[model samples]
Target: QTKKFPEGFLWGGAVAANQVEGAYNVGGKGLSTADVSPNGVMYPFDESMESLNLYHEGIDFYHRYKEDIALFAEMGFKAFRTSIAWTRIFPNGDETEPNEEGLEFYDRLFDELLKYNIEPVVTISHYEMPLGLIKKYGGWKNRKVIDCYEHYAKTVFTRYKEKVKYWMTFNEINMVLHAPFTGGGLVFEEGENKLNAMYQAAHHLFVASALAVKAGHDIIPDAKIGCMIAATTTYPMTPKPEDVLAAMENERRTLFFSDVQARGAYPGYMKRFFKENGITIEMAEGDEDILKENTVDYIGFSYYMSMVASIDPKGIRITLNTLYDRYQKPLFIVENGLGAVDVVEEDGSIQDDYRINYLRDHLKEVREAIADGVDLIGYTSWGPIDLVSASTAEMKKRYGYIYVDRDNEGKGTLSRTRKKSFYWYKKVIETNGESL
Candidate 1:
């Protein structure tokens, strides 16, 4: 009958640091992965942070955050999700003290959010890491990254503890499994051991996350620290037993990081998978104890879409992107929507019913997860307002209920308009899933 959210449930939006913060090079910040990424597809080995000046005019959030928060409040948002740019606090990601100017920016930002009685959930590290750290120490692959990250975490925890309560140690930490170079700064140079280097880099991030959790609690007694992982529910492509086995393998690869973060230990399947794949992760002697002691308080994940897993005749299972299909492993569509081809309709409005259906089907799965006793605290659909897509760096592949007047060629009025999904999401949040 009534599938209302729990009391004070967080219904809001999620945004990233590099995506929204346009002044990448201005505020004493160094280069990041996004700088090197020239375009969506062309991964030039010699690009710099010279395109899509999100750092300069990222939705103008730096200056218009108060106005943006007002819009979120008007939409009845109970909480807001955003990341603290690591460079903002530590320009080089290796400093004993934080810069007061960079720290003051967030103080004002958080104050604006609090003015509206909105809860601020901050991700310490989203997609961006200090370029200085990556250049000097080879990113997360080196154990030195752990110390640098922990230092940054402590500075933020102590500085913002009074204003912020919820913190996610790393944003989509498991993404390194797919895009090692941009994900966690694991560069793959010619003749370099790719897999080994990636795995080693992941190990360092895992330990750093655990240490940050521990240090966060020490700094803020009431802080709720969690690790953000990408959760894409996988289903078997076929009903055959072989397909089912293939799906299980796919799940194991993705779930390893979650198991360690949520369950406080590595699962048996991961150990065997690493051993079988000849992937040995180096760890210090006390790493296990640190992880056990610093287990996450809750699970925070971003679910964008579902994929099908099936065994090919060549003994290799294939994973294809798609929406929910029955006879597959139980599905949880956390994040799913269409990137509408930019076409202006006769009414001068972009009529995107396909995006509406995409969200409707995914919300169905959220309802199922709620029915299954999962503690899904809230669902803040990514990009409640149209912003840059993380993968493509394009605004056309939008996931927002509000349309931002920006285009791929960077030629729009930069005005915000309500999309068809705007009222749909407003009703969804208002009725707490009943309207969907």
Candidate 2:
């Protein structure tokens, strides 16, 4: 029998503020780590724009969101996922009052989505950290940062409770190790216990997320709060026992974030790993209780591709459909996509059949998971519109169904044009996956 999409399946796309909101300094926004950190691709700016970072003019979404939302509406999107740049709301990370201009911007932005009946799902933080906190308090390493984050959360929850009902506390909260500066606004010294620092900062994030979840529910009384994790299913490179063990460990590391937020406590293996690695997470007296009491209402995650877990750097391993343990709450895939170099011919048409090919296989996992009774929510493709790649440093590695005129050199007219996959995806949404 051909499968069908569940009722109310949210067909939409996912984006981040720092990656899309190019009006970096406009509207009273302060500097975020994204503004200074160089990870995207762009030609060495003409002396001045180089220092501004590639994200400074992030596809100019800040100004073009009205037009972009219109496009998503045209595609019949049911939901829209985006983050609120922390620096936009709290310019200095320590401000007692929020930037009114920043709040006003989102107010209008959310209203536009509502006008089209598109549900707006927001991430409180998505690597767009306030740089001021990093210098003074060493980012989330200091317990005081929790208070700062709590302040930021309280304001947003109270202000937008009526307009936005779905929220995520942190985007990829476990990213401190791989992306220190943007992930936690952190910089580690040579020979420092980096793992210890990661856990410490993570503890702060955990506490803040817990407190935010508590406050968001109490404030809105009907909001659904969740946690975002980077989920990549890992497969054993070989049938060897050691390989299986290594694969399990690697998979555990990937799932640790959801485990904590969903289970309301740190897994025992993580505790053991910390102890063996001489890592200790400093916590306030009520930190444990806060985490326990404010577990998320659901889980939100990103799944781009599966990876092989191999003892040898090079090994054969590729599989999908890896299952999650029986979880009580619902789960949603907020980011899933294939990043490929798309070409637009002179006729103003793109044949990105490759993009459509992989997308269907990815949806198969979503459908199978639902059929297995995972209590799934919906799927949203990553980068609906062409934007800068986060780690790769540019527009060269593209993931959007709508292509931007930009390039790896960051030079383009910034026009939006639909590709072949665009029409393909539009039908997918219109048919609710039944077309696939």
Candidate 3:
């Protein structure tokens, strides 16, 4: 029997505003954590306000999205996933009114994607939180940030109420524990209980996310709001019962986020872990009800294969099955890819067979998961076009099927070229993964 992806599966690419839309200071945009953190991890800045922040001119997508969208259309993309930079809209995180130019930029972008029948999947907040929030309110550690985020969410929901239908509240909402400043605009004080602070910030984010879900549902009756989690499978090192238990606990760390958003309450394991660690999450009276009343409609996630190559397909299958069985909700593979150093031939062609194999093998497992009864909806491979790497903030770790002529030091003409994987993926989408 020939296995096939479900009909109408969304095939596209995923990107974040901070990673792709460069113009860090243009169009009334205020400073964001990304603007100051060139290394992708947040750090302190001095008065000069200048650094090696390569994302500042991110392939000039802010000005060249039309060109990029056309290229995506050429790839037969059924959807396009990107985030709206928070600073672009609010300028300062506390701003009561949004920037008209910032709002209009996305209007034009959604229109362009629609012009080619590409659906726009939006993430309300990626790593591009306004630096103003961190400076003024100490980021998500303060409950005041919840109001700021709710205001921003409601504004965008009302503004683009009709243009965009699928939305995610935050990108990798769990990353706050790992990279406080980058994920939640948080910088810890010296000798403070860092875990407690991180948990407090996560509570604020949880409240903000739930409020966004409620607002989006009210503003756009048909909107499908989801939560983005960084999903990775932690396999047991051995079959020992203790090793299995350890793997389950490690996996729970990632699942805790989706459990709250999808199940509408904090999982018991997380609560117990917090209590044992002496971490108390301060929630307002309505926070629990807010979360319970507005659970997310689906789960969106990223599965990259620094974990892939040989057994990566099985890893994806395990991840897909686990999330689906746990939440019993629709799933969207929002980000997945192989980042490698691409070489441009003298003839200007990039033969990325390694990348192609990575995607093809991963996709095969995704199809198997669908056949195994996961209600999978879409797959937006990360970095369909070359842009700055999110973690390293470098151009060297390339993931795009289309190459951008830029380097780590930000050198290149910014020209776009099709790699071998470009055409390979085009056929993959054209046939809805049948060709794979």
Candidate 4:
């Protein structure tokens, strides 16, 4: 196990604002996208927001961050990734000034992490949009959102510049290309030309991200700004030239946003795709200058499962939930793991070898990517501590090395214990890649 990440490499866990912070309505917090969505576990409808109650008692992290940080430190974590609750700061999406209490909460939170000597990697937004904007202004489809987002970005950059050095403008920015409204408020479903609207939304986010990068540098001269993407690495189902071409197209589409963030410009293929789709993005006059001047320092992406791409001869349209049996290229399981499967086994101990295998395969690719010069700062397996699923918002879609004692039935001790993968991850981080 002599293989080790370069010195000063970050190793840690990740949690989200809505998924881990339970004080949903507390401390003068405003409602967010999670608040309006249906209960993810018990009632899988778009009705109520009180599913896991992470708002008030979310694993008690608000009170127990010290304890959790202790666990991460024990595992030799060099950094921890989490999101800032936008509603906690702005309460309303269009506020000119941030609420002091919301700002103060993270002050204390970051202070605790600093005390533990753990660097804080912060995501400015992680699927928690203020409900007011969605209801009143039609989400990202409205141009006003750019102002609100920039305001929020400036407030946070100026406020926590010293406490947090790593910042991601938006989490999984490309998810909006598919799930529009729910994916970080990037697009809306009501536009006359959906492709045009989606491209416009993407433009807004890219511009905002660039602006955030510029703001961070102005506020903290040494800040490291990165973009977060759901890295759905695609493979063709067969060796046929058409399938191979489709897989290449899929990878190009998947890498489009990240490339822009890292390189600060759109690739020629993306521009051609927009032209082919008859999509014309309305860009602000200075957007090109802003993007060119504020390229991100690094790229951070979430790897789930690898996917297969092919031409649907039946003209089947692709959706978020689409699946395939064969893949053309070797799939990179970026964020792959079991989602909402029963854990109990014949033995008293929980046997989650499937989860372990998933991580092993994903980590192997991560190692290969790094060796191939992918400039990845770190790889934090999502749901490191097992929280609600992002898409389904269910506790059953568990992805943690450490399992929490809660279930969809609203029963369990709400306890925390290490799973078989816990030690596996510890060794991986310790040796960096040699252990894997």
Q: What's the TM-score of every candidate structure?
A: 0.89, 0.94, 0.97, 0.86
Number of clashing pairs, model 4?
20
Q: What lDDT score goes with residue 422 in model 2?
A: 83
Q: Which of the predicted structures, 2 or 4, would earn the higher lDDT when compared with the native?
A: 2
Q: For each of the candidates, give the backbone clash count.
A: 7, 4, 1, 20
- Residue runs of model 3 more than 4 Å from their true location after superposition: 42-50, 306-311
Off by over 4 Å in 1: 41-45, 48-57, 189-191, 311-338, 342-350
Tens digits of lDDT, candidate 2, 121-155: 99999888787898888888888898999999999
TM-score computed on alpha carbons, candidate 4:
0.86
* Pairs in steric clash, model 1: 22-54, 22-55, 22-56, 23-55, 23-56, 303-335, 304-335
- Ordered by lDDT, highest first, the candidates read 3, 2, 1, 4
Better of 1 and 3 by TM-score: 3
lDDT of 1 by residue, 1-436 (tens): 4476556667888787676666766667666776556453224323544565333355656666776777777677777888998887888888888878789989998888888787888888887787778788888889998999988988999899899988888887777767776667777778877777888887788888999899888999998887676755577899999999987777766667767876677778777778788687878898888877888876676665556887111110111122112112222212334556545567767677877887776666566555544455566778777777777677777877777777777677777666777778778778877777
lDDT of each: 0.71, 0.81, 0.89, 0.70
Q: Clashes in candidate 1: how many? A: 7
User: Pick by TM-score: which candidate is best?
Assistant: 3
| Candidate 2 weakest ten by summed lDDT | 311-320
